[PDB]
Design a protein around this ligand. Structure first.
Ligand code: 1VU
Ligand code: ANP
Ligand code: BTN
Ligand code: MG
Lengths: 261, 673, 247
C-alpha cells in the first residue's frame, strides 16, 4: 500500500485553491478574479495545457522550511493553448501565494515557457499582478528578474509579446511589461510604480496617494507607459482576444489575411 | 643594533605622521613591539598600518584626539604598554602628561618633570642660564607692568627694543617696536593678544639683536651625570618664524667657537640636570658673539641631519637612556664626517606669503630613493589625505656628501626627481633657495627671505639659455606626441598613409611673448631652431613615465609634464618651477588672431578666500565702507591663522562669511563695488 | 604605459561610512592609460559619467555612476545619456567597462509622471543587447533592479568583479527588517544581525554571481588581461529585421 496516489490529489486540490479560501474571498471582494479563470476565459475551451505545476521553491531561510509556507505551483500558472485555432503560450501570477512575489521557481517556469515559445515560434501573453521580488530569498530574485529581462530582450522582434496589468505591480517587476510590444491596463484596480507612497513620504515630503501615483488614469493620460485602459476584467480579456486576433504568430510569417465581404 | 641587551618589549607612540613612522621603524629594527594611536580621519594612515595593534582615541579635532590625556591613558592601560614616546608637538612638553605617566607606572621617554618645568617659561630660563655662566641677551628681569616702566627700561637698554610675550609662543607673539609711542601701543596690543591666546599677559623687555644667525647645539644626556654636545646646526632660512632649510655643520663657525658653544650648552644641561636628548639655541651676531635663546626639552624636527655627520641613531639613544643604561660614547669620539643638508617639504602654496596651507588627496607619489646619498623621511603614501587639523608637513629630504657643494648638488637633483601629484607643495622655493648666490657663498641671516624677495616669491627667473632650452624641450615633446598619435595597427582593408612632414613650424607662447620654433626629427634626436639659435634634444621619449630625462647640448635635464590638452596648453615642471606654455602650429596661430577675446568679469572687487578652513572672526559688516590696508576676517586652518589684506576702496554690499562657518578654497567672501 | 601597473591610490578611496560620497572620475583616471579620458556630456545629467578612453592602446568606452551628484540615483536624463552611448559603442565593436555604485532609482512624483519606467527600460535593453566584450566592477553598492540594469552577470555579462567594500542586496537593512520582522516589533538586534550577515559581497559570491573579489590596487592589471581574452568573442542570436526599442 502506497500513498503516492492520494498525495497527487492533495497536491492538485491545494494548487487549484491557491493559498486558501480566505484569500480567494478577499480577492473577490476587491473585484478581481484568480489566475486560472483568467486563463479559461482567455483561451478556447478545452485547449489549455498546463506545465510545471509540481515545481516548488528551495528557500531555507527565515523559517520558510515549515509547511505553512509551502505552496505548490509557486504563485504562477504557465501553459500553452489556442485562440481561434492559433497557438499561444500563457503565464499568470497568483496574488494569493506570497502576493505573487517572484522566486527562483517562478522565474524558471517563466523562462521555460519563453524558451519553448521562441523555439517553436508562438506569441507570449502575460497577465501580471505581483508585488515584486520576495525579500527573504536575497539575490536569487534579482537573478530571476535579470533572466526574464534577458529573454524578453532576446525574443524582441521575433515573436510578439503582450501584457495585461490586472493588479498592483511594484518594484522591479514593472520592467518586463515595459520591454514588451504592448501594455494594457484595467481601471480602478491596476497600478504601476517603482516605489510605494511611503518612500515618497520619507524623501520628498509631499502629499500623494497610490491612485494618482500609479493608477491607470495617470499611465494612460500623462505618463505614456500604458496603451489602453479597460472598464473591468472580463471586458479587458475579451478585448485582448479581439486584439490578438489581429497580429501574426512570428516575424517570419506574412500579415494575417481573413475572409472579407 | 645589538638585540642581546634587554630593553622594553611594547612601546606606544603618542603622535602621528613622520615622527611616528620614524620611531616605529627604529623600534622595529631594535626588536620592540609597537602600538600606534590614531583619530577617525587617521584610520588609514601610514603609521597605523606599519605598527602592530591600534587604538582609536577620538574625533578629528586635536583637542579631542591627540591632546586628550584621558584617551591616551585608557589606551596605555588597555594595551599593557611599558613606555611611551611623545615625539615632538602635542603632549611632548606638557608637564601634566609626564606627571601622570610617572605617577601611574609608565616610563616616559624624555626629560623629567623638573627639567620641563624649568625650561618652560622665558623668565626663569634666563635667570637659570645667567646663574649657569651662559651668555644671555642684555635686558631687564621682571615682567613689565606699565608703559612708563617699559620706556624707562628702553632708555638704558638702547633704542632698539624687543618686547616679548612670556610663555606660549611657538612662532607667534613677537614684535620689534623701538619708538616710545610704538613701545606703549605694542605693550597694550601685545597684552590683549596674549589675553586672547593664552591670557597670562606677562611681557619682558630685552635688547633686539640685529642681523642674527640661529645656531642649535644638540645635547644628549643620561641619568648618570654625563652630557655630550653633538656638533652644531645652522637654521637661518625661516618664514613665519619656522625653519625650512637646515645645514648640518655651520660654515660660519670655526673649531674654537664651536667648542665654546658646546661647552656652554653642556654646562647649562648639567645645571638643569637634563637626562635626555635636547637642543640649545643661540643667536650669533656678525662679531661672532653668541647669546643664549631657548632650550627645547624634546626631540628636534631637524635631528636626522646631525646623525649623518655623526653616525648615531638618536631615537635609539633616547630609548636606551630611558631604560637606564649609560652612554656608550665619549666627547672625543664625536667627529664631523662629511656635510649634510635637510629640506622640509610642506603642503602649501609658495606664491602667497611664502606659503599658504592647502588641502587635497594625493594621486601620485614617488621618492628619489635610487639617487646616491639621499634619505627621505615621509609619513605619506599614494592615496593619503591632507586634513585641515594638523601640520601640512609632507616630507623631510636629507642629502649628505663629502663637502657643501656635493651635498647641494645632490639635493638639487633629488628635488628635481621628486614626484608629488594631487596637492600644492613648496618644492619650487626649496630648489630656488639652494641655488641662490648668497646662500652658496654663505652670507645668510634670519631675514634672508625678507630681503631677497621684497615683493614676494615670484618663481625661478630663467636666463636666455635656459629659456631657449625650455622652448626646445616643449617643442620636442609636442612633436613627439604628434608623431606617436600616428602609429596604428595594420588594417588589411584600408592601409594607413603616413604623412611625410619634414619640418614642423610652431608658434610658442610663454608669459606675454611669442616665439617661432622650427623642429626636425631624425629618429630619437630633435633639431630645434628657436629664433636662430640651434639646439639638439635627445631622449628615449617615453610619454607615459612621470619623469622625463633629456639631453640638450650635452646637458642632462629632468622635466615633468603636469598636464596637456588638445587646444595646445601644456604645463611643464622644469628646474622646480611650473611653466604654462601654449604651442600651436603656425597656420593655426595665424587663424587665432580672428578669435574674439572672452570677456573676464574679474577686476578686483572680490575678496574670495585664498585658503580653506574655518572663519572665526570677521571685522566688518555688510553696508560698510572699507579702506586700504586693514584685515577683513581671519581664517584658521592647519595650526595657522590668516587675515586677508586690503588696498581698494569700496562699500561692502554683502558678507557671505559668519563666525564658525566652514569655507573652501576660492569661495567668495566679501563683495564690494 | 605598462598594462601591469599597480594603482595603490584606490585602496582607500571609498570611505567606510556609507553617507559620504567620492568621485568616480578619480578612479577612472587612475585606471586608464596615461590618465587620459574624453568625457561625453560632462555638464548634463551629472549623476552618470560616460566617455572614451584607451586600455593597453585599445579604445574602450566607460560608463559609471557619480555618487557626488544625487548620491548616484538614476533618473530620466541619465538613462537616455547612458543608453545612447552604450548602443553606439556596441554598434562599432568597442568594449565596455562599467563601474557600479547605485542605490536605486530617484523617487518622486515628477519622475513618475515623466515616464521613468520607459527610460529605465531604455538602459536595461541597451545593456542586455550588447554583444561586445563587457567588464563590470562593483565598488560600493548595488541595490534592487538597478543592479540588474547595470550589466550584471545574468545579462550575458563576461566578467564581474567586486571590491572588498562592495555590498549587494535588494534594498537597505531597515526596509528588509521592517518588511520581514514586522510581528517581532523588535528591530534592535534584527538590524544588527542583518547588517552582519548580508551587508557584504559574500551572498553574491557564494552563488557565483561575481567571479572574484579583487584588491583595488590590482584592478587595472585585471581588466587588461580580460580584454586580451575576450577580443575574439562571438555570439549568435535569432534572426530578426530589428527589435522594438522602448522609444
Ligand atoms: C528588486 C525590486 C525591489 O526591491 S521590490 C521590494 C518590494 N517593494 C514594496 O513596495 C513591497 C511590495 N508590496 C506592495 O507594494 C503592496 O503590498 C502592494 C503590491 C501594492 C499590494 O497592496 P496591499 O493590498 O496593501 O498588500 P497586502 O496587504 O494584500 O499583502 C498581501 C501579502 O502579500 C505579501 N507581499 C507583497 N509583496 C511582497 C514581496 N515583494 N515580497 C514578499 N511578500 C510580499 C505581503 O507580505 C503580504 O503578506 P500577508 O499574506 O498579508 O501576510
Ligand atoms: N633679541 C632678539 N633679537 C632678534 N630676534 C629675536 C630675538 N629674540 C627672539 N628672536 C626671534 O625668535 C625667533 C625664534 O623663535 P623663538 O623665540 O626661539 O621661540 P618660538 O617662536 O616661540 N618657537 P620655538 O623656538 O620652536 O619653540 C628667531 O627667529 C628670532 O628672530
Ligand atoms: C599639530 O597637529 C601639528 C604637530 C605639532 C608640530 C610641532 S610643533 C613644534 C615643531 N615645529 C614644527 O614645525 N613641528 C613641530
Ligand atoms: Mg626657537
Amino acid at each position: 500500500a502506497t500513498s503516492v496516489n492520494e498525495r497527487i490529489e492533495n497536491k492538485r486540490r491545494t494548487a487549484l485553491l491557491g493559498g486558501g479560501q480566505r484569500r480567494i474571498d478577499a480577492q473577490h471582494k476587491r473585484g478581481k478574479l484568480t489566475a486560472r479563470e483568467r486563463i479559461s476565459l482567455l483561451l478556447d475551451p478545452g485547449s489549455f495545457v498546463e506545465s510545471d505545476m509540481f515545481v516548488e521553491h528551495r528557500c531555507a531561510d527565515f523559517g520558510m522550511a515549515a509547511d505553512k509556507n509551502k505552496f505548490p505551483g509557486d504563485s504562477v500558472v504557465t501553459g500553452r493553448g489556442r485562440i481561434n485555432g492559433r497557438l499561444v503560450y500563457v503565464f499568470s501570477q497568483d496574488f494569493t501565494v506570497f502576493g505573487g512575489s517572484l522566486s527562483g521557481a517562478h522565474a524558471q517556469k517563466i523562462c521555460k515557457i519563453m524558451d519553448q515559445a521562441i523555439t517553436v515560434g508562438a506569441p507570449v501573453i502575460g497577465l501580471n499582478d505581483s508585488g515584486g521580488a520576495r525579500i527573504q530569498e536575497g539575490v536569487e530574485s534579482l537573478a530571476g528578474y535579470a533572466d526574464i529581462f534577458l529573454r524578453n530582450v532576446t525574443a524582441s522582434g521575433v515573436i510578439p509579446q503582450i501584457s495585461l496589468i490586472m493588479g498592483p505591480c511594484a518594484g522591479g517587476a514593472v520592467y518586463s511589461p515595459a520591454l514588451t510590444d504592448f501594455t494594457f491596463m484595467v481601471k480602478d484596480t491596476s497600478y504601476l510604480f517603482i516605489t510605494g507612497p511611503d518612500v515618497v513620504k520619507s524623501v520628498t515630503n509631499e502629499d500623494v496617494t497610490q491612485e494618482e501615483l500609479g493608477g491607470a488614469k495617470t499611465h494612460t493620460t500623462m505618463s505614456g507607459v500604458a496603451h489602453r485602459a479597460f472598464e473591468n476584467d472580463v471586458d479587458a480579456l475579451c478585448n485582448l482576444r479581439d486584439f490578438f486576433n489581429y497580429l501574426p504568430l512570428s516575424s517570419q510569417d506574412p500579415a494575417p489575411v481573413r475572409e472579407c465581404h | 643594533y645589538d638585540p642581546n641587551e634587554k630593553t622594553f618589549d611594547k612601546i606606544l607612540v603618542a603622535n602621528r605622521g613622520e615622527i611616528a613612522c620614524r620611531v616605529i621603524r627604529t623600534c622595529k629594527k631594535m626588536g620592540i613591539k609597537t602600538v600606534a594611536i590614531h583619530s577617525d580621519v587617521d584610520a588609514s594612515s601610514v603609521h597605523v598600518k606599519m605598527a602592530d595593534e591600534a587604538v582609536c582615541v577620538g574625533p578629528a579635532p586635536t583637542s579631542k584626539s591627540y591632546l586628550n590625556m584621558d584617551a591616551i591613558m585608557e589606551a596605555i592601560k588597555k594595551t599593557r604598554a611599558q613606555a611611551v614616546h611623545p615625539g615632538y608637538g602635542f603632549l611632548s612638553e606638557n608637564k601634566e602628561f609626564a606627571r601622570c605617566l610617572a605617577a601611574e607606572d609608565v616610563v616616559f621617554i624624555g626629560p623629567d618633570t623638573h627639567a620641563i618645568q624649568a625650561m618652560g617659561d622665558k623668565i626663569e630660563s634666563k635667570l637659570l642660564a645667567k646663574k649657569a655662566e651662559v651668555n644671555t641677551i642684555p635686558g631687564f628681569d621682571g615682567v613689565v607692568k606699565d608703559a612708563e616702566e617699559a620706556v624707562r627700561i628702553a632708555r638704558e637698554i638702547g633704542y632698539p627694543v624687543m618686547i616679548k610675550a612670556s610663555a606660549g609662543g611657538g612662532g607667534k607673539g613677537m614684535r620689534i617696536a623701538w619708538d616710545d609711542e610704538e613701545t606703549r601701543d605694542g605693550f597694550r596690543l601685545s597684552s590683549q593678544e596674549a589675553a586672547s591666546s593664552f591670557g597670562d599677559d606677562r611681557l619682558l623687555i630685552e635688547k633686539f639683536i640685529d642681523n642674527p644667525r640661529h645656531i642649535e647645539i644638540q645635547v644628549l644626556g643620561d641619568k648618570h651625570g654625563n652630557a655630550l654636545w653633538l656638533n652644531e646646526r645652522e637654521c637661518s632660512i625661516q618664514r613665519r618664524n619656522q625653519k625650512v632649510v637646515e645645514e648640518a655643520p655651520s660654515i660660519f663657525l670655526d673649531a674654537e667657537t664651536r667648542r665654546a658653544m658646546g661647552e656652554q650648552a653642556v654646562a647649562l644641561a648639567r645645571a638643569v640636570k637634563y637626562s635626555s636628548a635636547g637642543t640649545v639655541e643661540f643667536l650669533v651676531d656678525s662679531k661672532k658673539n653668541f647669546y643664549f635663546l631657548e632650550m627645547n626639552t624634546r626631540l628636534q624636527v631637524e635631528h636626522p641631519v646631525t646623525e649623518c655627520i655623526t653616525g648615531l641613531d638618536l631615537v635609539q639613544e633616547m630609548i636606551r637612556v630611558a631604560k637606564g643604561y649609560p652612554l656608550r660614547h665619549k666627547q672625543a669620539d664625536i667627529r664631523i664626517n662629511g656635510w649634510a643638508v635637510e629640506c622640509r617639504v610642506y603642503a602649501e602654496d609658495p606664491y602667497k606669503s611664502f606659503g599658504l596651507p592647502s588641502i587635497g588627496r594625493l594621486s601620485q607619489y614617488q621618492e628619489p630613493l635610487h639617487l646616491p646619498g639621499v634619505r627621505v623621511d615621509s609619513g605619506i603614501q599614494p592615496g593619503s589625505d591632507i586634513s585641515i587639523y594638523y601640520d601640512p608637513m609632507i616630507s623631510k629630504l636629507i642629502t649628505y656628501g663629502s663637502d657643501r657643494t656635493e651635498a647641494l648638488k645632490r639635493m638639487a637633483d633629488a628635488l628635481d626627481n621628486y614626484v608629488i601629484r594631487g596637492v600644492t607643495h613648496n618644492i619650487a622655493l626649496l630648489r630656488e633657495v639652494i641655488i641662490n648666490s648668497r646662500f652658496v657663498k654663505g652670507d645668510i641671516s634670519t631675514k634672508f627671505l625678507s630681503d631677497v624677495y621684497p615683493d614676494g616669491f615670484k618663481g625661478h627667473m630663467l636666463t636666455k639659455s635656459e629659456k631657449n632650452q625650455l622652448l626646445a624641450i616643449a617643442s620636442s615633446l609636442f612633436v613627439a606626441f604628434q608623431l606617436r598619435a600616428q602609429h596604428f595597427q595594420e588594417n588589411s582593408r584600408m592601409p594607413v598613409i603616413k604623412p611625410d612632414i619634414a619640418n614642423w613650424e610652431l608658434s610658442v607662447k610663454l608669459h606675454d611673448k611669442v616665439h617661432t620654433v622650427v623642429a626636425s626629427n631624425n629618429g630619437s634626436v630633435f633639431s630645434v631652431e628657436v629664433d636662430g639659435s640651434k639646439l639638439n634634444v635627445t631622449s628615449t621619449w617615453n610619454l607615459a613615465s612621470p619623469l622625463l630625462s633629456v639631453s640638450v647640448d650635452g646637458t642632462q635635464r629632468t622635466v615633468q609634464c603636469l598636464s596637456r590638452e588638445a587646444g595646445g596648453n601644456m604645463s611643464i615642471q622644469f628646474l622646480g618651477t611650473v611653466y604654462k606654455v601654449n604651442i600651436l602650429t603656425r597656420l593655426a596661430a595665424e587663424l587665432n588672431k580672428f578669435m574674439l577675446e572672452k570677456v573676464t568679469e574679474d577686476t578686483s572687487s572680490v575678496l574670495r578666500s585664498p585658503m580653506p578652513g574655518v572663519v572665526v572672526a570677521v571685522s566688518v559688516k555688510p553696508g560698510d565702507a572699507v579702506a586700504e590696508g586693514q584685515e577683513i576676517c581671519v581664517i584658521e586652518a592647519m595650526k595657522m591663522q590668516n587675515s586677508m589684506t586690503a588696498g581698494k576702496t569700496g562699500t561692502v554690499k554683502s558678507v557671505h562669511c559668519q563666525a564658525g562657518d566652514t569655507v573652501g578654497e576660492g569661495d567668495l567672501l566679501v563683495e564690494l563695488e | 604605459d605598462p598594462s601591469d601597473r599597480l594603482v595603490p591610490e584606490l585602496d582607500t578611496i571609498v570611505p567606510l561610512e556609507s553617507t559620504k560620497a567620492y568621485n568616480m572620475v578619480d578612479i577612472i583616471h587612475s585606471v586608464v592609460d596615461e590618465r587620459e579620458f574624453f568625457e561625453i556630456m560632462p555638464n548634463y545629467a551629472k549623476n552618470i559619467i560616460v566617455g572614451f578612453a584607451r586600455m593597453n592602446g585599445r579604445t574602450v568606452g566607460i560608463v559609471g555612476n557619480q555618487p557626488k551628484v544625487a548620491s548616484g540615483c538614476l533618473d530620466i536624463n541619465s538613462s537616455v545619456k547612458g543608453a545612447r552611448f552604450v548602443r553606439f559603442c556596441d554598434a562599432f565593436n568597442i568594449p565596455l567597462i562599467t563601474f557600479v555604485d547605485v542605490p536605486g532609482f530617484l523617487p518622486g512624483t515628477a519622475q513618475e509622471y515623466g515616464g521613468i519606467i520607459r527610460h529605465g527600460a531604455k538602459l536595461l535593453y541597451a545593456f542586455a543587447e550588447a554583444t561586445v566584450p563587457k567588464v563590470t566592477v562593483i565598488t560600493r553598492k548595488a541595490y534592487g533592479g538597478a543592479y540588474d540594469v547595470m550589466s550584471s552577470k545574468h545579462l550575458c555579462g563576461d566578467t564581474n568583479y567586486a571590491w572588498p567594500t562592495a555590498e549587494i542586496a535588494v534594498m537597505g537593512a531597515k526596509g528588509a527588517v521592517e518588511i520581514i520582522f514586522k510581528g517581532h516589533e523588535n528591530v534592535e538586534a534584527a538590524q544588527a544581525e542583518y547588517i552582519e550577515k548580508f551587508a557584504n559581497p559574500f551572498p553574491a559570491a557564494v552563488r557565483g554571481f561575481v567571479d572574484d573579489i579583487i584588491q583595488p590596487s590590482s584592478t587595472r592589471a585585471r581588466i587588461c588581461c580580460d580584454l586580451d581574452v575576450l577580443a575574439s568573442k562571438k555570439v549568435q542570436r535569432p534572426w530578426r529585421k530589428h527589435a522594438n526599442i522602448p522609444l
